[PDB]
Amino acid sequence: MKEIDELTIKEYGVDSRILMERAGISVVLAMEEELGNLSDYRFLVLCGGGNNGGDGFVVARNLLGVVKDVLVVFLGKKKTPDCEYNYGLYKKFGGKVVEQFEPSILNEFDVVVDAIFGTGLRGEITGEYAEIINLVNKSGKVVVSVDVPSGIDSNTGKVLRTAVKADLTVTFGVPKIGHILFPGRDLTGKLKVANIGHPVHLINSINRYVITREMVRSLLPERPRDSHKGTYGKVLIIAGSRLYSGAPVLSGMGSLKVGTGLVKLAVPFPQNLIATSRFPELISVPIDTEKGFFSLQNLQECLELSKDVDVVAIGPGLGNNEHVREFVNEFLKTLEKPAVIDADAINVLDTSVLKERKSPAVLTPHPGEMARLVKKTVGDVKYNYELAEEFAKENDCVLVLKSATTIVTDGEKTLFNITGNTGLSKGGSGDVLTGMIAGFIAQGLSPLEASTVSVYLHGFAAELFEQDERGLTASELLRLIPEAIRRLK
Amino acid sequence: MKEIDELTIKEYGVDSRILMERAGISVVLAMEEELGNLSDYRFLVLCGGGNNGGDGFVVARNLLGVVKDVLVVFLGKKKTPDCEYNYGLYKKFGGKVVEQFEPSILNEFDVVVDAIFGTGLRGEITGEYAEIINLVNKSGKVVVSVDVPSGIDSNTGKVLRTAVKADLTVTFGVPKIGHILFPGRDLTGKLKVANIGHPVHLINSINRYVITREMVRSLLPERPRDSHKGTYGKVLIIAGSRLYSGAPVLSGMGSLKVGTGLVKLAVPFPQNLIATSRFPELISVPIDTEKGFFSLQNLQECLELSKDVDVVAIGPGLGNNEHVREFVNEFLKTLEKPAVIDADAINVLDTSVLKERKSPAVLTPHPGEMARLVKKTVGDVKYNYELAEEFAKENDCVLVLKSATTIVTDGEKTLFNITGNTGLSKGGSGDVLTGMIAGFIAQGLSPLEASTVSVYLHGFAAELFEQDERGLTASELLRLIPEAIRRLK
């Protein structure tokens, strides 16, 4: 993005003042769209000394004469050249500027435009800057942030001591990672992405994308009329234990509800019988076990069951103990099919095994399992997309790191998912996702594509729940999945 | 306007490239608003070598990558600096430019953007330029003109040999006279006025305005609850003859329907009886005449009737002969009340009389009566706002020159009216207008204000007619007037 602006000025030849003008007017238009007619409102524009503030000056100047009142509070010391220019325009146009903030000031304005810091923020905000942000946050006024709410680090989404909470953020060219990852995602409020005149080839060159409806629509496999269950693939899910008899059911149904032709579960007897008593469509193979858990004595039966399926999912509700550990690593070492490795299969996994595998793999950890997997803290891995990138690349796999914003990466391409809600914050929801991913691989999507489509549809199904989200359970989510698919087209 | 751009660059400090960028993007947004999503369409941009063409280059460049196809046909020889700059941007961005028009080209495009000439047009268009305009006009494509349709003289509305017919015109800052006066008004199609960043004080400094709903709403007199007919004034209308018994009725009702408290007509007996047989609310005084026309023998009776009225309208259906001439000029010379001078009172008027008058006057000619009044051709006076200005100023009066676009001026302030339709192109409609103006003066509006409000409301009433406009008659128009007033608030 810094790249993008520079190239658009330096190689394409667009005057930096023109980009700055387009930036500011796009903020005005976004506010009009969100607030209706702007002439009834009084606007307090907060401008730093950088180009974020310059953008602010453009906004203030364009409100002059058209709205009830404009005031700029200039908070910087030095001004960049474009900020200086635009400051001089605002003044020539008759705009009033002050240099000291008095708490009482929010009293006489309806909208605060936050142009203090954007992508040029470095390190923590303190001093006057922090007080003013805390005042704005306590004011209950409408807050529109220019580019990113001031205080959010645009590369990570972290709050640098304190940050503005916006009702509306107008960002330029492309969403920034700090709009996408929390807490920043929360502080952004409603996000508008404005076209300010970058050539389209530059906008498209960016390595990380948010997963969209259009991308997922184009990835959904085709349903030829002359087809049968074989057309849509077979999944084996190796799952469950005597502690967890339900997980396998949720995974298997996740596969069926996204359109897989045939799903076989392998589950310790008698827990395997639980699946068909809820959903008779599922096939649930009883695996004879010594203590209610998969072990090495079951290895050959499972490789045999895997011989004429398209994909194998393993992990949900297996339990984490040494017999499971032995079994999972020998299985994965010998299985020459794509694998979706989840849950307790991740908790026992030996990552050397992923390197010596010829067939592909998707790993689906929440941060707690990722932390354990790479031997780091939850805090070190949460939302750490570069870490996920390095791991996907080292181990020749797709890593789906699950959280309110899920990261899907293969080490080259990284995608962020922003669908879903807190109804998914409840056990079972991940077990469903695993089945969805395995299912899309069975139907012919690549691992990365299957994962992109699945995370998106899984979150969208949760949002379609009719009642309060907190009451959503995994069984209900399964039922919403084909509605999500329909609404997708 | 040339003034306006110059001052905005030279004194306010806005880079001319910035104004040009805002111009072009405002064209893109106006098209999106009118056409819906632009990505389905192919655009042929026609660019001259001036700043109109520069604006075109901005448009083309901003369509690149977002729409099905862009092509520019560059028609100029030299380029102005901003046109050159923007030409270079379009190219860098990957836009394709050709320099020769092939008739077959319109075939492969859906929208022609006309940026050949704007306000820099001088004299007639011939040569390649004319052929290309005639081709576009025969193509049946959607045509969007940048600033003014190429070929319209922006100061007069005249066609300079040939001109583009637009579906949409996006003009910058303020409407140009050439959008307002015909034929140009016709060639403009739907007009959008874009704010491109001129300071508002400059936009407001302009001497000529289009009459708007908001201006007319603020001018409507108040109706205090505790009031009576005296509050709302008295009008005398001196009108009619044995040739024209109906005109006075239409004028009198025009006064009543805009809220005048009392209207007295003076009309030769027995024609005066026609008025109350249609509308008994009117008072119609029989004037005893020798041959069915007002003459000098009626002068004293009329001055007497004028003594306790607020305004006198004179002219509709008086007839044009020497007895009427003598009577009208002696009357107006002695009457010390505001006068609305219409129709046959204009046809006999001696303009010296308007100079020696202490009280005010509004004259309401169509071009045929103006031509006769200043001893020029219809062609010389039609839509000639400077001539009307000079006349209003010389004779200390308001001149309302009536036509599809009516000019109202007092020599300092000139207003253009753009309401109405061809249903008003039928006898009687003017006689109604005269009463409306007299009525608003009676209620306390100045002559100029009464005329501004009247021309607007009169055209708006015609547009409210339920059936085909061509069937509208003056009696029906009277009935629509209070609906126009209601819709105005």
Partner: peptide
């Protein structure tokens, strides 16, 4: 809805 355009 009137900052950019007047009709």
């Amino acid at each position: 809805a009137a900052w950019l355009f007047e009709a």
